[PDB]
Design a protein around this nucleic acid. Structure first.
Ligand SMILES: [Mg+2]
Ligand SMILES: [Mg+2]
Ligand code: NA
Ligand code: NA
Length: 331
DNA sequence: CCGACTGCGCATCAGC
DNA sequence: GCTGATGCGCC
DNA sequence: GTCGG
């Protein structure tokens, strides 16, 4: 379980708003993560915070945030935030960043030029790049969650088509979906083939062929980016006669070397906390884990050649550990 | 006091 | 024309 | 903004 929004939702929301403002307007990504961290640890606190000093005891909450909590608890609001919400420039910039492709920098230019709304964007399509236009075109669709049943139907199509292109491909839908989530933000598909390894051929056709098949059967509808290794785009479940159309969805497809496949699966399955905690634990046992490989340290810190991996279990075993089921990888 | 806070693929810019 | 930087989305 | 060298 988890503490209800009722407990410290006002505080966590306040911290999340300030988090967004720092990243989108101040362009202070570290202060953005500082705030989110503070919001997380408070969202876990199973007690109604009575003072900023009480919250200060938590890892991620320092003096500044303690002061803000005191102001919020005593008044019900934060002056600095109340002033940011009313600022036309800060609000507009903040808003435009909700478009995929528009970050802090682009949002800034648009607002400096008067472009402050989606409507303003439509009248200025020539000023947008390919990514941004897709983000615009699907603004609303991209903010909708993906229920597990739809992800299942999406997986059906992906696994079916990949196998159809070459039955030797190995495909694994990762992300929260693999962790048994009831809903998802997007679909992350990891791909490999026996003919693709670190020391072999780079083959631009392996990822290209699969994307093509999914476009042939009308599953993939748009392309944000696509190289020889990574593909980012859009997909949509086919419409049932008479029933309403499905929302367009974000889908990523990655071609990974077979010898780095399982480290990739584990990584893109998350959770980020589970990854951080698993990396932190991996440190104690004298190992370093990333998206690509697992390497042995030699006391000074000399990481030798990447250890052989043939399954996710192999990784868990290496670090003296039992394989954690994806559904439990929450923390 | 003061540096770390992950680092990379792909698209697009800035400059030679 | 190229190479390197920057912006962006992401555990 | 917070933590830790
Ligand atoms: Mg700034
Ligand atoms: Mg993801
Ligand atoms: Na603290
Ligand atoms: Na954005």
């Amino acid at each position: 379980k988890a503490p209800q929004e009722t407990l410290n939702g006002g505080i966590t929301d306040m911290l999340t708003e300030l988090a967004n403002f720092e990243k989108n307007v101040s362009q202070a990504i570290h202060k953005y993560n500082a705030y989110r961290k503070a919001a997380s640890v408070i969202a876990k606190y199973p007690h109604k915070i009575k003072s900023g000093a009480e919250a200060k005891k938590l890892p991620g909450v320092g003096t500044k945030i303690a002061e803000k909590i005191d102001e919020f608890l005593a008044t019900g609001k934060l002056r600095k935030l109340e002033k940011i919400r009313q600022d036309d420039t800060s609000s507009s910039i903040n808003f435009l960043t909700r478009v995929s492709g528009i970050g802090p920098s682009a949002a800034r230019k648009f607002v400096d030029e008067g472009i402050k709304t989606l409507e303003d964007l439509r009248k200025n399509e020539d000023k947008l790049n390919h990514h941004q236009r897709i983000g615009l075109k699907y603004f609303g669709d991209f903010e909708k969650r993906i229920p597990r049943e739809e992800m299942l139907q999406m997986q059906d199509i992906v696994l079916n088509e990949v196998k159809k292109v070459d039955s030797e491909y190995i495909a694994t839908v990762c992300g929260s979906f693999r962790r048994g989530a009831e809903s998802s933000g997007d679909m992350d598909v990891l791909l490999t083939h026996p003919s693709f390894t670190s020391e072999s051929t780079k083959q631009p056709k392996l990822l290209h062929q699969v994307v093509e098949q999914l476009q042939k059967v009308h599953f993939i509808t748009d392309t944000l980016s696509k190289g020889e290794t990574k593909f980012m785009g859009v997909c949509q479940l086919p419409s049932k006669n008479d029933e309403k159309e499905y929302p367009h969805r974000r889908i990523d497809i990655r071609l990974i070397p077979k010898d780095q496949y399982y480290c990739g699966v584990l990584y893109f399955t998350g959770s980020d906390i589970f990854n951080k905690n698993m990396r932190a634990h991996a440190l104690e046992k004298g190992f370093t884990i990333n998206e690509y490989t697992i390497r042995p340290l030699g006391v000074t810190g000399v990481a030798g050649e990447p250890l052989p991996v043939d399954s996710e279990k192999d990784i868990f075993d290496y670090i003296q550990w039992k394989y954690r089921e994806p559904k439990d990888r929450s923390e």
